[PDB]
């Protein structure tokens, strides 16, 4: 008991386990707001673009956007801020278009010294860096479809379009998109990036040893994965949802690859890929409804406890139940 | 980086609106009424940037641009706690001194005669701003400096920034007060018409709503146009404390407004805040709960918009959007979302999904917050059509009425009819009855 | 004193028992080898011997799980093994010293384990929680809860709809503003019958519904697994009850609405078969909830209050569950089975008295004549049996019944049958 | 959830009745006349949800609807402390104050002036309710303004609730007091068409028996028409405590009447209280028992009915039901079954099941009790038919005399004649036998 005791008080006070938990926070939760929006505006306008990751992962692209970001956000100066860094996981030849994992190459690191990292093992930095990687494809995702969506309102604006029955039906799929997606991201903040959170803080200052360190930080990591959906129980309903993502992303590049045309009928302006995007809306919509059945049904199932959160998150209008 | 606002105060309500609003920034940010921050502002963790420009390390200043017709509200200005925030270059006041004399077109006119002037503080301001997205103006639009004034203003941040988006948060006149501004339905329409013109998203703030919540939640009789600009600032203040203060969530406007615009016409917006508490009531922080913010939000007190009650449309919000700040507890949201179920508490646009998305944002740690959680939503309800087709209603009524005309009569935009507020009706009841539409399932064909 | 049965070679008089059981191994795990037993080992003493060890078993297996939380005795336990030093001393084995010294240790850690029980662990709320879920204590409650579910829980139960019942249930706790989030994840909902495995079943899902309570450390030593089976079966019995009044409400509430409908012969006599089937469960209902339920709810609360051991206290609330399950007739096959019986003829007239507003048609008024039939005959069966239990005095709560049910004599004018509703 | 009662407030004399019971249930609840619950409310054992809505957060307001054709009343009530206690949507008040003229015709005429408001805050208040049973109508049947208004709101509950139960408090005139209101025969004639036609369950209240509890239970010597409200207010109060006080039994409308309503006709209850005592009289705590009681339930001088002597009519309860509360004790309760039983207090019905029941409830902790154990009984008794023959006897005299019936001859309702006066005679006279039949075994047919 002694032992323990001078143990916990030699992580707290001298090897800042605190302190790296709260750069934890600050780097790879994008505590900086502004950091994470200036980076994910990056990585949306680079994967629209079609640019490979010897283009995007290149280190002068990588280090111009991370200082960017930094210079952008309050706490991008701070020094746990500094502790963050972008590396690649592999090297993609061609960014594949519409693919949520496009991003997934990219792995947030953190340095433990010792002993701390016998408590931060690698592993738990190499699951950081996954709910990192995964944090900043939906970022990825999320700006380029408002992207897609400012695009459209830009072209409106130039062309006078706010009459487009097609202009008007690509926006209100592209809102519809965007609001589903922020519930989802809302839910999977609360339960993973929040609750998990404040229960890795609660047991970081609970830690009695370096193995009771490493147990605590393990929870953290697992709870941020269960309720981020990133359980391999959860893995079927994560490759739904990463399917759901790529069929946004998809309308998403079809409404971006054109402007709205100006106003030539009576229908208002035409979009050239207006059928596409109709298209990938119905596609849309139905995997969505598809969605709410099967989670429906996987609740009612008590499978997945969870993911009765996700069908609530997705439903809490109870939008998705009456249609 | 954050996307930076440029606010634009127009007129007597616009110009209380904007000292109101750097007031509640300085506050939470513990910037002195000089602009200079408070040694007790410590937690460099709120964006000046976003509505505020540094004029050196040490000294904030608003991006805003001030622009009236009428002096009386820039000298208030001057004498607010708000004058030394705002830069003196970028405050415009007509040299004339005589006002619009309250009436639209007057203002208009002074602020097309100023237009240079303040597009240049304009641009003043937006160098300011790191990542600046656009310009939002507050105003007036029962007044006849404010209304004027912030259509001038718009119409040259379009003009200026024809690329960059313009929202406008266009106060619309009480129509359960009587309006000193008996011109006020006609300025109204004009504001409409340059929101409709010139501004890509028009956010409607009836002053009716206003005053009823300074009624019956702050417990103000009358509420002045002063008392409801700052009870606007407020609520912008609180649901910008996002942006203002950068968090792993709603880092940005568009992800917040995203889920609340279906279509770049139907951009006619409810707002909702919870927990609702009057400013006097700030000592007892209640221990609100998710349950509990959701049951308050529920209550037509706290609601920004004053709808009609049409009988005849079942109006309804299609989505609703909350970001909650503060301590939030997941298993209270939860409990809450249970309890609306069961209550059914939300109607949802039933031809695509919807929900309620929920964003969590820090609290300035300078601004002591009386409420453990607060929360904005931002909806878009086909009551909100109620408050637009009231303001169209207004607008023709007076314009067939004539009445007040003679103060518009003096400039030369309604000197002879009011067929500009007449067409500006039309198009604010079109706008109305598109919003109610995407509560419908044809939504998917409007337009 | 280590509740360490240290017998590798079977030599002591106590057997290990097979551990019923981190389901820490049964106090069962050891057990009193009866034919090993010292002859010179009076049955009473042993009895007290093994409910020494399993209570010392129990205390050190919660003392695994609790923070270290001494031993009742303390320091005192040293005390007891000089006192059985002195008797090992001793030329003679007096059984009296012995049991003595046992006693004292039993009351101290008794009474160490009543007051962690009721001060420290709070057995009275979830006594109370017991009460107001399992035995349908919030009776009202679990009325409007019925009244809400019924048309989710009136279908057969599937593997599925366990978990919509469950939603149901909160949905009217939250409407019935029962706004407990920590009774709620106390409350299970059960399993598929009859289609809806839901293969097995006698009656259809909605019988089969069950309600399960997971019972926390150390109160889980209270609720064992014959205790919550038979608070499952009050919770049926219970729900059937509200099942049936809500069945009769109906009726009446069709009726009401029907009362700008001429009242036509039949339907008066449907009207009037529900009424008296409504006074008559009713009465029974009131009977069950004060003479039974409060009356041995009173007596458990008052005798735990009443008494410094956590046995005595388990008595008191095993002796409430026996007087629950004696004066519901639970026990008596044969009457439960005609009870149920005349439940379902007065839950089939109450269907019948609801989906007719006006006069019954030529289904409606044979649906009426067999349901007046069977409740006639049902009620002269149980009031014969009431009266005969009245006059056998076997059962207070029976013959408080058959005065109950017969207060205006009617049945007794009747011959004890609920009159003919006239089809 | 708990079965939402909607309290309906018909006319003058019925607005008074309703705003006093309103009244009554607050103080038992711990609801203030603004509608904030009192910090001495701790009791969350009530049904508030039943009898009241929420109007905010924490205030909440009875679900009463107060419709007067007489402003006096309304306007009293609006003047009050319980102003806020009522929907202000609910409340109807005739801008000319002159009420009925003591003529049902024109307070039915004021009601359906106001039928599509009056439904409309009905349907409201549904709404407002998370499961409404109905609507309960609180009037006076002898006036103008409540007898006619108390008619157009039984009308407007079928209109808008066919499907949910109409109960209507229908006051029978005093019959030793003289009634102001000359019409009240034909008041009370219209009452009885729409208990007959439109409400679901009437609970009759003679005032003659109100006004004999008074005098000899409440130690009142001269009842004013507003203490006869007051003691019908109470008594319905008392009678639906285990409505309004949830608890193991008797916990919904439905259930309750179920037991009380032979035939959907037969839907006039009876209603009786023991052991009575007065508001004043607290100081002498009685130790009244359970049997005693019983035995005092069964004196004419307890009953909530002023039944005339029948001579002809072997009178006898059809159903007898007592809601006990307060402090009970299960063996007092048995010894008062005991003695109702070795007494025979109660004669029932020989074509079905019946007996006077017992629930035992807690009393209100938020209202002071004058008695330390009280109970109300319901019963449906065949004397209640001499009561209803007397009502129907008046009805049809004052029909076929046209007595009063020019103030109501203003009104359409009895502009021409008096035939639905007559129509409702009738139909009271039917119930009359058919609760003579009730006492026999061709109760079975009662109603028919």
Same mark, same amino acid.
């Given at each position: 008991?002694?032992?323990?005791?001078?143990?916990?008080?030699?992580?707290?006070?001298?090897?800042?386990?605190?302190?790296?938990?709260?750069?934890?926070?600050?780097?790879?939760?994008?505590?900086?707001?502004?950091?994470?929006?200036?980076?994910?505006?990056?990585?949306?306008?680079?994967?629209?673009?079609?640019?490979?990751?010897?283009?995007?992962?290149?280190?002068?692209?990588?280090?111009?956007?991370?200082?960017?970001?930094?210079?952008?956000?309050?706490?991008?100066?701070?020094?746990?801020?500094?502790?963050?860094?972008?590396?690649?996981?592999?090297?993609?030849?061609?960014?594949?278009?519409?693919?949520?994992?496009?991003? =997934?190459?990219?792995?947030?690191?953190?340095?433990?010294?010792?002993?701390?990292?016998?408590?931060?093992?690698?592993?738990?930095?190499?699951?950081?860096?996954?709910?990192?990687?995964?944090?900043?494809?939906?970022?990825?995702?999320?700006?380029?479809?408002?992207?897609?969506?400012?695009?459209?309102?830009?072209?409106?604006?130039?062309?006078?379009?706010?009459?487009?029955?097609?202009?008007?039906?690509?926006?209100?799929?592209?809102?519809?998109?965007?609001?589903?997606?922020?519930?989802?991201?809302?839910?999977?903040?609360?339960?993973?990036?929040?609750?998990?959170?404040?229960?890795?803080?609660?047991?970081?200052?609970?830690?009695?040893?370096?193995?009771?360190?490493?147990?605590?930080?393990?929870?953290?990591?697992?709870?941020?994965?269960?309720?981020?959906?990133?359980?391999?129980?959860?893995?079927?309903?994560?490759?739904?949802?990463?399917?759901?993502?790529?069929?946004?992303?998809?309308?998403?590049?079809?409404?971006? =690859?054109?402007?709205?045309?100006?106003?030539?009928?009576?229908?208002?302006?035409?979009?050239?890929?207006?059928?596409?995007?109709?298209?990938?809306?119905?596609?849309?919509?139905?995997?969505?409804?598809?969605?709410?059945?099967?989670?429906?049904?996987?609740?009612?199932?008590?499978?997945?406890?969870?993911?009765?959160?996700?069908?609530?998150?997705?439903?809490?209008?109870?939008?998705?139940?009456?249609? | 980086?954050?996307?930076?606002?440029?606010?634009?105060?127009?007129?007597?309500?616009?110009?209380?609106?904007?000292?109101?609003?750097?007031?509640?920034?300085?506050?939470?940010?513990?910037?002195?009424?000089?602009?200079?921050?408070?040694?007790?502002?410590?937690?460099?963790?709120?964006?000046?940037?976003?509505?505020?420009?540094?004029?050196?390390?040490?000294?904030?200043?608003?991006?805003?641009?001030?622009?009236?017709?009428?002096?009386? *509200?820039?000298?208030?200005?001057?004498?607010?706690?708000?004058?030394?925030?705002?830069?003196?270059?970028?405050?415009?006041?007509?040299?004339?001194?005589?006002?619009?004399?309250?009436?639209?077109?007057?203002?208009?006119?002074?602020?097309?005669?100023?237009?240079?002037?303040?597009?240049?503080?304009?641009?003043?301001?937006?160098?300011?701003?790191?990542?600046?997205?656009?310009?939002?103006?507050?105003?007036?639009?029962?007044?006849?400096?404010?209304?004027?004034?912030?259509?001038?203003?718009?119409?040259?941040?379009?003009?200026?920034?024809?690329?960059?988006?313009?929202?406008?948060?266009?106060?619309?006149?009480?129509?359960?007060?009587?309006?000193?501004?008996?011109?006020?339905?006609?300025?109204?329409?004009?504001?409409?018409?340059?929101?409709?013109?010139?501004?890509?998203?028009?956010?409607?703030?009836?002053?009716?709503?206003?005053?009823?919540?300074?009624?019956?939640?702050?417990?103000?009789?009358?509420?002045?146009?002063?008392?409801?600009?700052?009870?606007?600032?407020?609520?912008?203040?609180?649901?910008?404390?996002?942006?203002?203060?950068?968090?792993?969530?709603?880092?940005?406007?568009?992800?917040?407004?995203?889920?609340?615009?279906?279509?770049?016409?139907?951009?006619?917006?409810?707002?909702?805040?919870?927990?609702?508490?009057?400013?006097?009531?700030?000592?007892?922080?209640?221990?609100?709960?998710?349950?509990?913010?959701?049951?308050?939000?529920?209550?037509?007190?706290?609601?920004?918009?004053?709808?009609?009650?049409?009988?005849?449309?079942?109006?309804?919000?299609?989505?609703?959007?909350?970001?909650?700040?503060?301590?939030?507890?997941?298993?209270?949201?939860?409990?809450?979302?249970?309890?609306?179920?069961?209550?059914?508490?939300?109607?949802?646009?039933?031809?695509?999904?919807?929900?309620?998305?929920?964003?969590?944002?820090?609290?300035?740690?300078?601004?002591?917050?009386?409420?453990?959680?607060?929360?904005?939503?931002?909806?878009?309800?086909? =009551?909100?059509?109620?408050?637009?087709?009231?303001?169209?209603?207004?607008?023709?009524?007076?314009?067939?009425?004539?009445?007040?005309?003679?103060?518009?009569?003096?400039?030369?935009?309604?000197?002879?009819?009011?067929?500009?507020?007449?067409?500006?009706?039309?198009?604010?009841?079109?706008?109305?009855?598109?919003?109610?539409?995407?509560?419908?399932?044809?939504?998917?064909?409007?337009? | 004193?280590?509740?360490?049965?240290?017998?590798?070679?079977?030599?002591?008089?106590?057997?290990?028992?097979?551990?019923?059981?981190?389901?820490?191994?049964?106090?069962?795990?050891?057990?009193?080898?009866?034919?090993?037993?010292?002859?010179?080992?009076?049955?009473?003493?042993?009895?007290?011997?093994?409910?020494?060890?399993?209570?010392?078993?129990?205390?050190?297996?919660?003392?695994?799980?609790?923070?270290?939380?001494?031993?009742?005795?303390?320091?005192?336990?040293?005390?007891?093994?000089?006192?059985?030093?002195?008797?090992?001393?001793?030329?003679?084995?007096?059984?009296?010293?012995?049991?003595?010294?046992?006693?004292?240790?039993?009351?101290? *850690?008794?009474?160490?384990?009543?007051?962690?029980?009721?001060?420290?662990?709070?057995?009275?709320?979830?006594?109370?929680?017991?009460?107001?879920?399992?035995?349908?204590?919030?009776?009202?409650?679990?009325?409007?809860?019925?009244?809400?579910?019924?048309?989710?829980?009136?279908?057969?139960?599937?593997?599925?709809?366990?978990?919509?019942?469950?939603?149901?249930?909160?949905?009217?706790?939250?409407?019935?503003?029962?706004?407990?989030?920590?009774?709620?994840?106390?409350?299970?909902?059960?399993?598929?019958?009859?289609?809806?495995?839901?293969?097995?079943?006698?009656?259809?899902?909605?019988?089969?519904?069950?309600?399960?309570?997971?019972?926390?450390?150390?109160?889980?030593?209270?609720?064992?697994?014959a205790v919550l089976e038979k608070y499952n079966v009050v919770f049926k019995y219970l729900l059937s009850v509200r099942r049936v009044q809500a069945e009769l409400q109906h009726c009446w509430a069709l009726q009401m609405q029907r009362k700008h409908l001429k009242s036509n012969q039949t339907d008066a006599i449907k009207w009037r078969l529900r009424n008296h089937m409504a006074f008559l469960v009713d009465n029974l209902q009131y009977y069950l909830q004060v003479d039974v339920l409060e009356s041995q709810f009173s007596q458990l609360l008052h005798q735990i209050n009443s008494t410094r051991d956590f046995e005595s206290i388990r008595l008191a609330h095993d002796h409430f569950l026996s007087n629950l399950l004696a004066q519901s007739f639970i026990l008596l096959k044969p009457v439960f089975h005609c009870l149920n019986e005349i439940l379902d003829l007065c839950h089939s007239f109450c269907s019948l008295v609801s989906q007719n507003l006006g006069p019954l048609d030529e289904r409606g008024?044979?649906?009426?004549?067999?349901?007046?039939?069977?409740?006639?005959?049902?009620?002269?069966?149980?009031?014969?049996?009431?009266?005969?239990?009245?006059?056998?005095?076997?059962?207070?709560?029976?013959?408080?019944?058959?005065?109950?049910?017969?207060?205006?004599?009617?049945?007794?004018?009747?011959?004890?049958?609920?009159?003919?509703?006239?089809?």
């Amino acid at each position: 008991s002694l032992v323990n005791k001078a143990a916990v008080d030699y992580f707290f006070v001298e090897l800042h386990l605190e302190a790296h938990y709260e750069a934890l926070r600050h780097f790879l939760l994008m505590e900086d707001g502004e950091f994470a929006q200036s980076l994910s505006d990056l990585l949306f306008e680079k994967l629209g673009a079609g640019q490979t990751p010897g283009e995007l992962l290149n280190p002068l692209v990588l280090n111009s956007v991370l200082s960017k970001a930094l210079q952008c956000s309050l706490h991008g100066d701070t020094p746990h801020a500094s502790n963050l860094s972008l590396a690649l996981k592999y090297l993609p030849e061609v960014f594949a278009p519409n693919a949520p994992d496009v991003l =997934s190459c990219l792995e947030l690191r953190y340095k433990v010294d010792w002993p701390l990292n016998i408590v931060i093992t690698e592993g738990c930095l190499s699951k950081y860096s996954g709910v990192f990687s995964f944090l900043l494809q939906l970022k990825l995702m999320m700006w380029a479809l408002k992207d897609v969506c400012f695009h459209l309102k830009r072209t409106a604006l130039l062309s006078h379009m706010a009459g487009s029955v097609q202009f008007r039906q690509l926006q209100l799929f592209k809102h519809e998109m965007q609001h589903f997606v922020k519930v989802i991201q809302g839910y999977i903040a609360n339960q993973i990036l929040h609750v998990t959170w404040c229960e890795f803080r609660a047991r970081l200052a609970t830690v009695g040893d370096l193995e009771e360190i490493q147990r605590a930080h393990a929870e953290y990591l697992h709870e941020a994965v269960f309720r981020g959906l990133l359980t391999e129980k959860a893995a079927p309903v994560m490759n739904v949802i990463h399917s759901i993502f790529s069929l946004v992303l998809k309308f998403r590049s079809q409404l971006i =690859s054109q402007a709205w045309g100006p106003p030539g009928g009576p229908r208002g302006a035409e979009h050239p890929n207006f059928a596409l995007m109709q298209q990938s809306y119905n596609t849309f919509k139905y995997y969505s409804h598809f969605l709410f059945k099967v989670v429906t049904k996987l609740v009612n199932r008590g499978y997945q406890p969870h993911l009765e959160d996700f069908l609530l998150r997705i439903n809490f209008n109870n939008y998705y139940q009456d249609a | 980086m954050p996307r930076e606002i440029i606010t634009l105060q127009l007129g007597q309500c616009g110009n209380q609106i904007g000292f109101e609003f750097w007031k509640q920034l300085c506050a939470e940010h513990g910037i002195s009424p000089e602009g200079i921050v408070e040694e007790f502002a410590t937690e460099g963790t709120d964006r000046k940037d976003v509505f505020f420009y540094q004029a050196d390390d040490e000294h904030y200043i608003p991006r805003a641009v001030l622009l009236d017709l009428e002096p009386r *509200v820039i000298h208030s200005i001057l004498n607010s706690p708000y004058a030394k925030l705002y830069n003196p270059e970028n405050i415009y006041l007509s040299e004339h001194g005589g006002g619009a004399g309250n009436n639209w077109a007057s203002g208009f006119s002074q602020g097309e005669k100023i237009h240079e002037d303040i597009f240049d503080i304009i641009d003043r301001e937006a160098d300011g701003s790191d990542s600046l997205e656009g310009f939002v103006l507050c105003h007036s639009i029962a007044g006849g400096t404010g209304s004027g004034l912030g259509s001038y203003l718009l119409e040259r941040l379009n003009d200026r920034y024809p690329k960059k988006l313009v929202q406008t948060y266009s106060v619309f006149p009480n129509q359960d007060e009587m309006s000193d501004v008996v011109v006020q339905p006609y300025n109204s329409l004009l504001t409409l018409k340059r929101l409709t013109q010139n501004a890509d998203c028009v956010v409607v703030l009836d002053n009716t709503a206003l005053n009823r919540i300074a009624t019956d939640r702050l417990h103000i009789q009358n509420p002045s146009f002063s008392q409801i600009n700052q009870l606007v600032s407020t609520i912008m203040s609180a649901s910008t404390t996002t942006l203002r203060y950068p968090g792993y969530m709603n880092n940005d406007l568009i992800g917040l407004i995203a889920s609340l615009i279906p279509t770049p016409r139907l951009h006619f917006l409810m707002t909702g805040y919870t927990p609702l508490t009057t400013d006097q009531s700030v000592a007892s922080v209640r221990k609100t709960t998710v349950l509990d913010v959701m049951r308050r939000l529920l209550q037509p007190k706290n609601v920004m918009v004053s709808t009609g009650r049409d009988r005849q449309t079942n109006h309804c919000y299609i989505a609703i959007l909350n970001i909650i700040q503060g301590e939030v507890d997941p298993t209270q949201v939860h409990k809450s979302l249970q309890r609306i179920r069961e209550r059914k508490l939300a109607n949802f646009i039933p031809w695509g999904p919807a929900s309620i998305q929920v964003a969590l944002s820090r609290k300035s740690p300078y601004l002591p917050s009386a409420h453990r959680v607060s929360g904005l939503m931002m909806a878009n309800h086909t =009551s909100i059509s109620s408050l637009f087709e009231r303001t169209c209603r207004q607008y023709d009524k007076l314009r067939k009425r004539e009445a007040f005309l003679e103060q518009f009569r003096k400039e030369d935009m309604f000197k002879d009819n009011f067929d500009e507020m007449d067409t500006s009706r039309e198009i604010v009841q079109q706008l109305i009855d598109e919003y109610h539409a995407a509560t419908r399932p044809d939504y998917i064909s409007w337009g | 004193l280590h509740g360490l049965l240290l017998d590798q070679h079977e030599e002591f008089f106590i057997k290990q028992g097979p551990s019923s059981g981190m389901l820490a191994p049964s106090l069962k795990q050891f057990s009193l080898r009866v034919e090993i037993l010292p002859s010179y080992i009076p049955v009473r003493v042993a009895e007290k011997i093994l409910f020494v060890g399993e209570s010392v078993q129990m205390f050190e297996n919660q003392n695994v799980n609790l923070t270290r939380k001494g031993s009742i005795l303390k320091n005192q336990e040293d005390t007891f093994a000089a006192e059985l030093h002195r008797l090992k001393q001793q030329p003679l084995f007096s059984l009296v010293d012995f049991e003595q010294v046992v006693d004292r240790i039993r009351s101290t *850690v008794a009474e160490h384990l009543w007051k962690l029980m009721v001060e420290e662990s709070d057995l009275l709320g979830q006594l109370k929680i017991i009460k107001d879920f399992y035995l349908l204590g919030r009776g009202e409650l679990f009325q409007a809860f019925i009244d809400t579910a019924q048309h989710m829980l009136k279908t057969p139960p599937t593997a599925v709809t366990e978990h919509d019942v469950n939603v149901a249930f909160q949905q009217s706790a939250h409407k019935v503003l029962l706004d407990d989030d920590n009774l709620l994840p106390l409350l299970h909902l059960t399993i598929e019958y009859h289609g809806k495995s839901p293969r097995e079943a006698p009656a259809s899902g909605w019988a089969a519904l069950g309600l399960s309570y997971k019972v926390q450390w150390p109160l889980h030593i209270l609720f064992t697994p014959a205790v919550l089976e038979k608070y499952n079966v009050v919770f049926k019995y219970l729900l059937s009850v509200r099942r049936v009044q809500a069945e009769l409400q109906h009726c009446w509430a069709l009726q009401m609405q029907r009362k700008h409908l001429k009242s036509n012969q039949t339907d008066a006599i449907k009207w009037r078969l529900r009424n008296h089937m409504a006074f008559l469960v009713d009465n029974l209902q009131y009977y069950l909830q004060v003479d039974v339920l409060e009356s041995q709810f009173s007596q458990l609360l008052h005798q735990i209050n009443s008494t410094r051991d956590f046995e005595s206290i388990r008595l008191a609330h095993d002796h409430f569950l026996s007087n629950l399950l004696a004066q519901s007739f639970i026990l008596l096959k044969p009457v439960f089975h005609c009870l149920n019986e005349i439940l379902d003829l007065c839950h089939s007239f109450c269907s019948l008295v609801s989906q007719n507003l006006g006069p019954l048609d030529e289904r409606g008024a044979a649906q009426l004549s067999i349901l007046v039939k069977g409740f006639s005959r049902q009620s002269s069966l149980l009031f014969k049996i009431l009266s005969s239990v009245r006059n056998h005095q076997i059962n207070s709560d029976l013959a408080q019944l058959l005065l109950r049910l017969d207060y205006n004599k009617y049945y007794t004018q009747a011959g004890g049958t609920l009159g003919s509703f006239g089809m």
